């Protein structure tokens, strides 16, 4: 990476909007972190709940569909750690809720496995499919832990 790209990525990880504003260009907004997993600034801002930076990035050309080395999109990252506002923002900017990574995990597999009730609810409201099997043959419902009966209820979708 160029020193400037490195600086932008750290600024995104940190939620440093003022620095992001300084460095963010057409050329850099979707740069990849070569030293990590080819994460974009938006991947980092999403995983670390940097809401103001996610807003800025999304308004300035950031790619919600960018895949990292594992095939993860920034929505996977937000969903894994329960970042509701970030997830909501990504979906508003056209994130596809059923997109799958290299292990065929969707963001709903992730939210389910991580026990994130509101994230699961948000994804389902936007048409996420709780029946999609990953590489292991597991659906998101399969990945819900025994005691998370609320998330089970949600993904099972009993008639209502």
């Amino acid at each position: 990476n160029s020193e400037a790209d490195r600086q932008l990525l750290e600024a995104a990880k940190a939620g440093d909007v003022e620095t992001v504003k300084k460095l963010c260009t057409v050329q850099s907004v979707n740069c990849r972190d070569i030293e990590g997993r080819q994460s974009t600034p938006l991947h980092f801002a999403a995983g670390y709940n940097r809401v103001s930076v996610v807003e800025y990035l999304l308004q300035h050309g950031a790619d919600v569909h960018a895949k990292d080395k594992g095939g993860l999109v920034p929505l996977h990252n937000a969903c894994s750690y329960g970042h509701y506002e970030v997830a909501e923002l990504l979906v508003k900017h056209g994130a596809v809720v059923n997109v799958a990574d290299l292990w065929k995990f969707t963001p709903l597999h992730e939210a389910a496995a991580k026990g994130k009730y509101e994230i699961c609810k948000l994804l389902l409201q936007h048409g996420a499919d709780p029946t999609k099997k990953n590489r292991d043959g597991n659906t998101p419902l399969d990945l819900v832990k025994d005691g998370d009966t609320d998330i089970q209820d949600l993904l099972r979708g009993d008639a209502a």
């Binding site: 990590g36 997993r37 980092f44 995983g47 670390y48 990292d68 996977h76 894994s80 750690y81």
Partner: peptide
């Protein structure tokens, strides 16, 4: 090849 945890953390709003 195992799937690694996604990049991120449980950073409070």
């Amino acid at each position: 090849v195992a799937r690694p945890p996604p990049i991120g953390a449980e950073v409070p709003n």
